[PDB]
């Protein structure tokens, strides 16, 4: 199986970044920040924590975790939720559980790398369903019809998508579901990037009984450090997944689940904090893209990742290295998603970091005129 592309870039280059606009998370919370924004008393949390056995705990996730996650959806019960070690752990559990040698898997591309390389390592025939810049970074549904076979086991998507930040609304998702439903294919939808836009973007599990929703508190809820995610699916899928957790994780952490319960009990407070960070930072990014003649993009659907086109006749791998070498501005070069000529720009970092980063990138782009 090949080296994880974005990881291999961040391993070699993250420690050399002064202005990091590469990461695609929304400025993380400290535990004290979580207490302040939730209106919680620290002492009450520490009292419960310190007397809690750090044993294997709730393997499935706490009852409160499951009920809170279920309430984020329409028509999903607590029993349909399995806690995982992040969305990373959820994607792995789903694929390792369900993908078998000879199965046909269609994966959105470029997308989160797990979604096509894990199936390929398990012996599945993987076809890449290509996103198109000319159609607002959405893939082509007629190409999906051509790719699908009467035996297709699974279609993997990322909604909103990494790196583009484009989303499939209800209309688009329904046409995808119809195509999938013809051959009885599951649809795995990694939904860690929640759209804050006006668009009607339901979860795959709310429109399809064979939809498998993956999500986490990492990107949308600013808590990657607890490694808490989930899988939401039907009873048949959930019952298979329960018997494979010891291959990948056994379970998530006891403290981690405690923090997830508190965050989920105050999820609206966190969403409000993050909606404002995203809206403000995206307004700053929109104005900057317009002032710069060498850069353009398809604006993301109010999601914390963007894919910006740089009008410079150079390999972005080289452009980004020199940008980091000279000014300390870290981006992910487009070649890491097999779409060279672009750069992934995560703009949901601390506002000043984005401002200074763009200002330094603006000084860098001046030599190309």
Does the footprint of a copy of itself cover residue 151 (CB under 8 A)?
no
Among 55, 74, 236, 325, binds a copy of itself (CB under 8 A): 55
Among 11, 181, 322, 363, binds a copy of itself (CB under 8 A): 11
- Of the pair 25, 152, the CB lying nearest a copy of itself is at 25
- Of the pair 173, 344, the CB lying nearest a copy of itself is at 344
Does the footprint of a copy of itself cover residue 223 (CB under 8 A)?
yes
Does the footprint of a copy of itself cover residue 39 (CB under 8 A)?
no
Q: Give the separation between CA 295 and CA 310, rounded to whole angstroms.
A: 5
Does the footprint of a copy of itself cover residue 50 (CB under 8 A)?
yes
- Of the pair 234, 248, the CB lying nearest a copy of itself is at 248
- Of the pair 31, 147, the CB lying nearest a copy of itself is at 31
Cis check for the bond before 110: say yes or no (omega within 30 of 0): yes
Find, among 91, 88, 68, 70, the residue nearest to 79 by Cα: 70
Cα–Cα separations (whole angstroms), residue 221 to 56, 59, 129, 141, 153:
25, 22, 29, 31, 31
Does the footprint of a copy of itself cover residue 118 (CB under 8 A)?
yes
Find, among 27, 7, 50, the residue nearest to 280 by Cα: 27
Long-range own/partner contacts, residues 275-282 (CB < 8 A, 24 or more apart): 275/196, 275/302, 277/26, 277/27, 277/348, 277/351, 278/26, 278/196, 278/302, 278/303, 278/304, 278/348, 279/196, 280/351, 281/347, 281/348, 281/349, 281/351, 281/354, 282/347
- Of the pair 28, 234, the CB lying nearest a copy of itself is at 28
Q: Give the separation between CA 201 and CA 302, rounded to whole angstroms.
A: 12
- Of the pair 61, 202, the CB lying nearest a copy of itself is at 61
Binding mask 238-257 for a copy of itself (x = CB under 8 A): ----xxxxxxxxxxxxxxx-
Among 7, 132, 317, 338, binds a copy of itself (CB under 8 A): 7
Q: Which residues contact 328 (CB under 8 A, 6 or more apart)?
A: 16, 17, 18, 19, 360
- Of the pair 202, 229, the CB lying nearest a copy of itself is at 229
Interaction site with a copy of itself (CB under 8 A): 1, 3-4, 6-8, 11, 23-26, 28-32, 34-35, 42, 46, 49-57, 59, 85-86, 88-89, 92, 96-97, 100-101, 113-114, 117-118, 121-123, 222-227, 242-256, 259
């Amino acid at each position: 199986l090949p080296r994880f592309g974005v990881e291999e870039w961040l391993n070699v280059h993250e420690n050399s970044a002064i202005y990091d606009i590469a990461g695609v998370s929304i400025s993380s919370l400290t535990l004290e920040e979580l207490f302040a924004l939730s209106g919680t008393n620290p002492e009450d949390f520490y009292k419960k924590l310190q007397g809690t056995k750090l044993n294997y705990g709730w393997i499935e996730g706490s009852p409160a975790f499951k009920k809170s996650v279920s309430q984020l959806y329409t028509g999903v019960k607590p029993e349909q939720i399995l806690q995982t070690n992040g969305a990373t752990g959820a994607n792995l559990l789903v694929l390792y559980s369900l993908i078998e040698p000879g199965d046909h898997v269609i994966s959105l591309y470029p997308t989160y790398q797990q979604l096509y390389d894990i199936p390929k390592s398990l012996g599945a025939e993987v076809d890449l369903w290509q996103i198109e810049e000319e159609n607002g970074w959405l893939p082509d549904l007629e190409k999906l019809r051509q790719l699908i076979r009467p035996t297709t086991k699974m279609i993997c998507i990322n909604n909103a998508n990494n790196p583009t930040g484009a989303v499939m609304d209800r209309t688009y998702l329904e046409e995808l579901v119809e195509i999938a439903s013809e051959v009885g294919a599951y649809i795995l939808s990694d939904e860690v990037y929640r759209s804050f836009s006006e668009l009607d973007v339901p979860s795959i599990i709310e429109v399809y009984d064979k939809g498998i929703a993956v999500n986490s508190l990492s990107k949308t809820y600013s808590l990657p450090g607890i490694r808490i995610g989930w899988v939401a699916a039907n009873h048949q899928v959930t019952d298979i997944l329960r018997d494979y957790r010891d291959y990948t994780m056994i379970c998530a952490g006891v403290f981690d689940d405690l923090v997830a319960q508190l965050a989920l009990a105050h999820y609206q407070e966190i969403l409000e904090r993050n909606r404002h960070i995203l809206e403000e930072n995206l307004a700053i990014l929109d104005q900057w893209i317009e002032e710069e003649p060498l850069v353009s993009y398809i604006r993301p659907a109010v999601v914390s990742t963007s894919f910006v086109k740089i009008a410079v006749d150079m390999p972005m791998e080289d452009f980004c290295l020199q940008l980091l070498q000279e000014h300390g501005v870290l981006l992910v070069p487009g070649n890491r998603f097999e779409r060279d000529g672009y750069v992934r720009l995560g703009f949901a970092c601390e506002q000043e970091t984005l401002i200074k980063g763009l200002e330094k990138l603006s000084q860098f782009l001046r030599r190309f005129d």
